[PDB]
Design an enzyme around this catalytic site. Structure first.
Site, PDB file in Angstrom:
ATOM      1  N   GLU A 130      38.302  30.373  47.669  1.00  0.00           N
ATOM      2  CA  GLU A 130      38.933  31.420  46.879  1.00  0.00           C
ATOM      3  C   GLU A 130      40.117  32.007  47.638  1.00  0.00           C
ATOM      4  OE1 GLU A 130      36.345  34.088  44.412  1.00  0.00           O
ATOM      5  OE2 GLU A 130      34.754  33.360  45.757  1.00  0.00           O
ATOM      6  N   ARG A 136      25.463  31.265  40.990  1.00  0.00           N
ATOM      7  CA  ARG A 136      24.356  31.788  40.190  1.00  0.00           C
ATOM      8  C   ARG A 136      22.952  31.542  40.737  1.00  0.00           C
ATOM      9  NH1 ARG A 136      25.530  29.582  34.397  1.00  0.00           N
ATOM     10  NH2 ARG A 136      26.878  28.107  35.531  1.00  0.00           N
ATOM     11  N   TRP A 149      29.749  37.646  47.399  1.00  0.00           N
ATOM     12  CA  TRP A 149      30.504  37.312  48.596  1.00  0.00           C
ATOM     13  C   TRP A 149      31.416  36.129  48.284  1.00  0.00           C
ATOM     14  CZ3 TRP A 149      25.056  37.467  48.781  1.00  0.00           C
ATOM     15  CH2 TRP A 149      24.408  36.234  48.622  1.00  0.00           C
TER      16      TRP A 149
HETATM   17  C1  HEM Z   1      26.954  36.102  45.511  1.00  0.00           C
HETATM   18  C2  HEM Z   1      27.968  35.270  45.766  1.00  0.00           C
HETATM   19  C3  HEM Z   1      28.868  34.714  44.640  1.00  0.00           C
HETATM   20  C4  HEM Z   1      29.671  33.652  44.789  1.00  0.00           C
HETATM   21  C5  HEM Z   1      29.833  32.788  46.066  1.00  0.00           C
HETATM   22  C6  HEM Z   1      30.352  33.433  43.532  1.00  0.00           C
HETATM   23  C7  HEM Z   1      31.271  32.444  43.284  1.00  0.00           C
HETATM   24  C8  HEM Z   1      32.136  32.431  42.213  1.00  0.00           C
HETATM   25  C9  HEM Z   1      33.409  31.736  42.130  1.00  0.00           C
HETATM   26  C10 HEM Z   1      34.070  30.876  43.228  1.00  0.00           C
HETATM   27  C11 HEM Z   1      33.913  31.949  40.915  1.00  0.00           C
HETATM   28  C12 HEM Z   1      35.265  31.419  40.395  1.00  0.00           C
HETATM   29  C13 HEM Z   1      36.178  32.644  40.400  1.00  0.00           C
HETATM   30  C14 HEM Z   1      37.627  32.285  40.439  1.00  0.00           C
HETATM   31  O1  HEM Z   1      37.954  31.173  40.929  1.00  0.00           O
HETATM   32  O2  HEM Z   1      38.447  33.127  39.979  1.00  0.00           O
HETATM   33  C15 HEM Z   1      32.998  32.805  40.177  1.00  0.00           C
HETATM   34  C16 HEM Z   1      33.162  33.257  38.878  1.00  0.00           C
HETATM   35  C17 HEM Z   1      32.411  34.223  38.236  1.00  0.00           C
HETATM   36  N1  HEM Z   1      31.328  34.915  38.780  1.00  0.00           N
HETATM   37 FE1  HEM Z   1      30.378  34.417  40.599  1.00  0.00          FE
HETATM   38  N2  HEM Z   1      29.941  34.405  42.628  1.00  0.00           N
HETATM   39  C18 HEM Z   1      29.030  35.227  43.278  1.00  0.00           C
HETATM   40  C19 HEM Z   1      28.419  36.331  42.707  1.00  0.00           C
HETATM   41  C20 HEM Z   1      28.589  36.821  41.425  1.00  0.00           C
HETATM   42  C21 HEM Z   1      28.047  38.063  40.881  1.00  0.00           C
HETATM   43  C22 HEM Z   1      27.202  39.092  41.672  1.00  0.00           C
HETATM   44  C23 HEM Z   1      28.436  38.160  39.593  1.00  0.00           C
HETATM   45  C24 HEM Z   1      28.099  39.269  38.553  1.00  0.00           C
HETATM   46  C25 HEM Z   1      26.979  40.015  38.598  1.00  0.00           C
HETATM   47  C26 HEM Z   1      29.222  36.973  39.281  1.00  0.00           C
HETATM   48  C27 HEM Z   1      29.774  36.669  38.059  1.00  0.00           C
HETATM   49  C28 HEM Z   1      30.814  35.813  37.846  1.00  0.00           C
HETATM   50  C29 HEM Z   1      31.561  35.737  36.614  1.00  0.00           C
HETATM   51  C30 HEM Z   1      31.344  36.554  35.310  1.00  0.00           C
HETATM   52  C31 HEM Z   1      32.622  34.665  36.877  1.00  0.00           C
HETATM   53  C32 HEM Z   1      33.703  34.179  35.883  1.00  0.00           C
HETATM   54  C33 HEM Z   1      34.964  34.990  36.182  1.00  0.00           C
HETATM   55  C34 HEM Z   1      36.085  34.679  35.235  1.00  0.00           C
HETATM   56  O3  HEM Z   1      35.869  33.960  34.212  1.00  0.00           O
HETATM   57  O4  HEM Z   1      37.211  35.175  35.513  1.00  0.00           O
HETATM   58  N3  HEM Z   1      29.300  36.194  40.414  1.00  0.00           N
HETATM   59  N4  HEM Z   1      31.923  33.066  41.004  1.00  0.00           N
HETATM   60  N1  9P4 Z   2      32.984  35.310  45.075  1.00  0.00           N
HETATM   61  C1  9P4 Z   2      33.196  35.686  43.780  1.00  0.00           C
HETATM   62  C2  9P4 Z   2      32.168  36.192  42.977  1.00  0.00           C
HETATM   63  C3  9P4 Z   2      32.392  36.551  41.644  1.00  0.00           C
HETATM   64  C4  9P4 Z   2      33.686  36.414  41.142  1.00  0.00           C
HETATM   65  C5  9P4 Z   2      33.984  36.765  39.823  1.00  0.00           C
HETATM   66  C6  9P4 Z   2      35.293  36.615  39.349  1.00  0.00           C
HETATM   67  C7  9P4 Z   2      36.293  36.125  40.196  1.00  0.00           C
HETATM   68  C8  9P4 Z   2      37.740  35.976  39.801  1.00  0.00           C
HETATM   69  N2  9P4 Z   2      38.059  35.631  38.417  1.00  0.00           N
HETATM   70  C9  9P4 Z   2      39.525  35.716  38.418  1.00  0.00           C
HETATM   71  C10 9P4 Z   2      40.189  35.164  37.168  1.00  0.00           C
HETATM   72  C11 9P4 Z   2      41.680  35.380  37.380  1.00  0.00           C
HETATM   73  C12 9P4 Z   2      42.472  35.092  36.130  1.00  0.00           C
HETATM   74  C13 9P4 Z   2      43.866  35.103  36.187  1.00  0.00           C
HETATM   75  N3  9P4 Z   2      44.604  34.852  35.097  1.00  0.00           N
HETATM   76  C14 9P4 Z   2      44.001  34.584  33.927  1.00  0.00           C
HETATM   77  C15 9P4 Z   2      42.607  34.562  33.812  1.00  0.00           C
HETATM   78  F1  9P4 Z   2      42.012  34.289  32.635  1.00  0.00           F
HETATM   79  C16 9P4 Z   2      41.826  34.820  34.930  1.00  0.00           C
HETATM   80  C17 9P4 Z   2      35.993  35.790  41.513  1.00  0.00           C
HETATM   81  C18 9P4 Z   2      34.692  35.918  41.979  1.00  0.00           C
HETATM   82  N4  9P4 Z   2      34.432  35.569  43.261  1.00  0.00           N
END
Ligand code: HEM
Ligand code: 9P4
Ligand code: HEM
Ligand code: 9P4
Ligand code: H4B
Ligand code: H4B
Ligand code: ZN
Lengths: 411, 407
Positions: free
Chosen positions: A285, A111, A280
């Site tokens: 991941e 963020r 990115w």
């Molecule tokens: C720019 C580089 C970014 C990086 C390195 C990053 C990194 C991450 C990582 C590692 C997670 C955990 C996801 C997982 O393990 O499944 C995550 C979750 C999340 N990201 Fe970021 N993110 C980035 C950009 C963004 C952007 C552009 C958005 C939306 C505009 C965003 C919104 C979210 C949301 C909503 C989650 C929660 C997903 C969930 O609950 O399944 N991210 N992010």
């Molecule tokens: N690098 C990034 C950036 C934003 C992202 C936003 C979201 C995610 C992935 N969220 C995946 C959740 C997968 C899941 C699987 N089973 C149950 C769940 F509630 C959720 C990865 C991201 N990686």
């Protein structure tokens, strides 16, 4: 009410006032914590205060709170709601809303980048072909030949819940998974069910280990349609190790652009059920979860064999050893090909500074420790030692049910 | 009201009914989760006694028995008369085992029913306390074949006559602040190491000096005692591949024996209840050795490995972290001191959860603490949803006694 969080490594103590603006529920009670649970048609009745809350926020951000422009806008929205039962966001409000949903995403370690987000307004879109076109443009823009740029594309908001725009894919780019008669899985096990749907919908599967899935796109509540992303738009990276030369022969690669496409974006009470976004990757991941989860590609054994580790006892930590080398390889491969990626040390350190900055300028930064802490090497990243407060602010990104479970088929 | 937890790696779903028994508060609200925060009279007393006796008597298939009712009556009269009451040996042991059983942050709870309880409620002096503790240490150490134990000193009365062990663990290394500005020994204990010296201790001022016991009986001033060295089992740390590792000069003790917690049973408070099990390898190799505010040895180890420490992206820290932890397990195993790796221990805990859900209706668990501080998602607990809630009997934190003590 003031709330304090403590970093137990630095003794830095921060005060949260921002949690007072929180409205939504957490899942927790005074009697139980649901902090580790993964997942714990709206009337004019409820809609206007949600609009008002949002517009009050928006106009404060631009230092015009209580202005005539503020007042007239509230007026305009109220009338438009009671007349039409919904309302349309200005472009400015849409962009503000999308950025703040990201800023409010307590599970996101990335963020610090929230204010740099390219918003693509796709609210004039009417068909699945139109959606494919928008999505291609997003992928090309966001990929930027390896120099990744965060972007989001926003399709029309929900109306009666019977004309929803949905991207049926969980990510814009993802590998197919195929269950074999012998029970084994070819490709990405996470995507078996979705792959099956695609196939049924008419997709001709190459049945390889890394087949890029087709887009399954639903416009205006109609049945979804299949499209293939032009391969020249799909940037992929062959995974090799800087010291281990047999690593290339593992045959691994991944895609450069993580683009989540199944979430719902809420802004001022309006629901955008199709809002693919991309940033990115953090290395883990792919290297930890995608490659090494038992229920994913699960390459730990084959890697450890090739490294010749003592695999007869877990206490050799052969799993831990293979895990590190794989993650080194992921980072090495992306950097070598000049595709944007961030390691979990860099990303978490940045997050701490962001969070501290947010406490000062904003009065808080909601954060989900369970998700913020990387899936390897937890306590040697600073977030492990950081106390965090988890609460829900709007605008927000929310989970929504998979469209195949709710969709009414036209035929 | 009947809650489901899911394992996302196996799709196993368990239903939790046990949480409805819970009575104490979590610190969370509907508006805010505090899951990652480290620290969130006669009339008061009888319902607490009653709740406890009801579960005890239910546990032995005598719920609604004469003996049950009689006991309830007896304790009820004793409270009325004495403003407190005494636990029967059977109840004390049950209570202690269950405080452990209920410790939502403990990954090692599959062992909960095999706990040796030492009743030290007849103790009156710090010398007495020392003796009991030496006995505990010798028993638990068992020449390296560790056995879980707790020693229980007299219960709080009026808060003026508290039994307290001042050490955070029975066995810990000294911490000295140099003029050099650095910190020699364990930085975690710098303040305690001072209070020892302020009370008369003679520090060898080494990197690994076993701290002396500071023991407080019946509210009196605490006294120093040196644990007989022959009772302190230590392990020199070597690597089974890197011959240079021995030159780092690292060692650790075999017996993790937490001494600063409060055992609450049936409303009664035991301010002095040191307990011990055995180590999970990461506690030492990841936390003790690699935490920045601890021994912080990652840099020196990395250099000895000749890793590219230029960029974080070489994951040099991660690489060293593994090797260090390999060495910790290797050393303890070599010297035959009980230790468990984080893989074995978390696998055990999943099985324990299964058992608890099946036989008790649930198992309170704090994911933030249960998931090991390295290699999180390659252990099964990472993929395991958990419900955190507070059951009694319990181990609780309590203030450090020097902030409280009326000298
Ligand atoms: C720019 C580089 C970014 C990086 C390195 C990053 C990194 C991450 C990582 C590692 C997670 C955990 C996801 C997982 O393990 O499944 C995550 C979750 C999340 N990201 Fe970021 N993110 C980035 C950009 C963004 C952007 C552009 C958005 C939306 C505009 C965003 C919104 C979210 C949301 C909503 C989650 C929660 C997903 C969930 O609950 O399944 N991210 N992010
Ligand atoms: N690098 C990034 C950036 C934003 C992202 C936003 C979201 C995610 C992935 N969220 C995946 C959740 C997968 C899941 C699987 N089973 C149950 C769940 F509630 C959720 C990865 C991201 N990686
Ligand atoms: C026998 C093998 C045992 C193992 C492998 C084990 C493992 C662990 C670990 C790794 C932690 C996290 C501690 C930290 O990171 O600081 C912990 C916490 C804890 N353990 Fe266990 N333990 C064992 C025995 C016991 C026993 C015998 C008791 C009490 C009778 C106990 C009670 C607790 C409590 C109350 C906590 C939470 C401490 C706190 O909140 O600070 N454990 N355990
Ligand atoms: N192997 C074992 C067994 C039982 C244990 C029981 C307790 C502990 C350590 N708990 C100490 C927590 C340190 C701490 C420091 N500052 C604030 C805290 F809340 C807690 C370690 C154990 N290790
Ligand atoms: C059960 C538990 O909540 C689940 O495995 C969570 C843990 N933390 C996580 N953290 C991230 N970043 N991503 C995840 O998928 C998960 N999964
Ligand atoms: C800030 C956070 O609550 C704190 O670092 C916790 C995280 N998880 C932990 N887990 C264990 N087992 N032990 C700990 O001391 C901690 N510390
Ligand atoms: Zn909570």
């Amino acid at each position: 009410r003031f709330l304090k969080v403590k970093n137990w490594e630095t003794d830095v103590v921060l005060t949260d006032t921002l949690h007072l603006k929180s409205t939504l529920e957490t899942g927790c009670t005074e009697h139980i914590c649901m902090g580790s649970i993964m997942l714990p048609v709206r009337t004019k009745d409820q809609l206007f205060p949600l609009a008002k809350e949002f517009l009050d926020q928006y106009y404060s951000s631009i230092k015009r709170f209580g202005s005539k422009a503020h007042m007239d806008r509230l007026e305009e929205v109220n009338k438009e709601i009671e007349s039409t039962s919904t309302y349309q966001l200005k472009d400015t409000e849409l962009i503000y809303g999308a950025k703040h949903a990201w800023r409010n995403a307590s599970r996101c370690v990335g963020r610090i980048q929230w204010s740099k987000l390219q918003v693509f307004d796709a609210r004039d879109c009417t068909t699945a072909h139109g959606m494919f076109n928008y999505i291609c443009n997003h992928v090309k823009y966001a990929t930027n030949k390896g120099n990744l740029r965060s972007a989001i594309t926003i399709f029309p908001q929900r109306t009666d819940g019977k004309h929803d725009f949905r991207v049926w894919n969980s990510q814009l780019i993802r590998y197919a998974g195929y269950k074999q008669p012998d029970g084994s899985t070819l490709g990405d096990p996470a995507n078996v069910q979705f792959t099956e749907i695609c196939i049924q919908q008419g997709w001709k599967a190459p049945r390889g280990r890394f087949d890029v899935l087709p887009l399954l796109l639903q416009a205006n509540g109609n049945d979804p349609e299949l499209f293939q992303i032009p391969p020249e738009l799909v940037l992929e990276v062959p995974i090799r190790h800087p010291k281990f030369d047999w690593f290339k022969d593992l045959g691994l690669k991944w895609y450069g652009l993580p683009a989540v496409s199944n979430m719902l974006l809420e802004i001022g009470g309006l629901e955008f059920s199709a809002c693919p976004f991309s940033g990115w990757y953090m290395g883990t991941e792919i290297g930890v979860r995608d490659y090494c989860d038992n229920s994913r590609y699960n390459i730990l054994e084959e890697v450890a064999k090739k490294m010749d580790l003592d695999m007869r006892k877990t206490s050799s930590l052969w799993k831990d050893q293979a895990l590190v080398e794989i993650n080194i390889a992921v980072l090495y491969s992306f950097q070598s090909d000049k595709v944007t990626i961030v390691d979990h040390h860099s990303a978490t350190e940045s997050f701490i500074k962001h969070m501290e900055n947010e406490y000062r300028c904003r009065g808080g930064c909601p954060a989900d420790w369970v998700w913020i802490v990387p899936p390897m090497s937890g306590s040697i990243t600073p977030v492990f030692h950081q106390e965090m407060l988890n609460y829900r602010l709007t605008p927000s990104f929310e989970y929504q049910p998979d469209p195949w479970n709710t969709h009414v088929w036209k035929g």
